[PDB]
């Protein structure tokens, strides 16, 4: 059950903005339930696989392209590509959304919604979902920020350790070589002393 909310400015009443919530079980292709709200009244509708197939066949284009366009229009994922306009007759529950370009309008999708007896339940459900999402997002952000701070501290510590290692690298070799020189000099002293003693005979 994945749902997404979006804002729409109906042509009939542009001043007032309405909220459309679309929820689907597995994917938008299988079907989705739409709920339109404005703060005073709410309307509900459903779209199944048969309706989407009929719309695709009537529009005569690839199913994937139709699904993508419908998702972009309903979820408000569009950028500057185009402008989608939505109309909804409050006295007929005949909602429909199209896209406008170069003074050309094409009917993209149409649904027949149904009014709900009580809008309080749906409004409360939407607000509760939004609040839960906000709380979960805040918790995840705080946890990730703490993890990032820990990672930064660890990076600083390891960088300091690397600096210490590189600094000591050359001192190790210098001490090794001078110690080698001392021991070799002592051994050479011993060898020459024995040589002198032996040749004394």
């Amino acid at each position: 059950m994945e749902r997404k909310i979006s804002r729409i400015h109906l042509v009939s009443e542009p001043s007032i903005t309405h909220f459309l919530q679309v929820s689907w079980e597995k994917t938008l292709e299988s079907g989705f339930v739409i709920t339109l709200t404005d703060g005073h009244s709410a309307w509900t509708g459903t779209v199944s696989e048969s309706e989407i197939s009929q719309e695709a066949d009537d529009m005569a284009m690839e199913k994937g392209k139709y699904v993508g366009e419908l998702r972009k229009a309903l979820l408000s994922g569009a950028g500057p590509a185009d402008v989608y306009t939505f109309n909804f007759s409050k006295e007929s529950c005949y909602f429909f959304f199209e896209k406008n370009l170069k003074d050309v309008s094409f009917r993209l999708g149409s649904f027949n919604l149904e009014k709900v007896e009580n809008p309080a339940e749906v409004i409360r459900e939407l607000i509760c979902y939004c609040l839960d999402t906000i709380a979960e997002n805040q918790a995840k952000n705080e946890h990730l920020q703490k993890e990032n701070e820990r990672l930064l501290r660890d990076w600083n510590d390891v960088q300091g350790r690397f600096e210490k290692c590189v600094s000591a690298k050359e001192a190790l070799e210098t001490d090794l070589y001078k110690r080698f020189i001392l021991v070799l000099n002592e051994k050479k002293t011993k060898i020459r002393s024995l040589h002198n003693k032996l040749l004394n005979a």
Binding site: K178, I181, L184, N185, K188, I191, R192, H195
Partner: protein, 70 residues
């Protein structure tokens, strides 16, 4: 011979002459004297030189009686 050319490889494989690095020569012209031969400059040792240096220096360039520096 400074570079190990094919001629140098052939002569060293001969085992009859000793090869000396050019560096020694340069030193000979800096002190205005003859620098005694040392392993630091030699690239190969003739059998007589090998026998002479066997009891005077290691199989490597390490010193036997005189102290060594860095």
């Amino acid at each position: 011979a400074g570079s190990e050319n094919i001629r140098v490889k052939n002569i060293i494989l001969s085992n009859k002459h000793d090869v000396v690095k050019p560096a020694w020569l340069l030193e000979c012209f800096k002190t205005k004297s003859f620098v005694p031969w040392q392993p630091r400059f030699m690239i190969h040792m003739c059998p007589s030189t090998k026998e002479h240096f066997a009891r005077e220096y290691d199989c490597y360039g390490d010193s036997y009686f005189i102290d060594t520096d860095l």
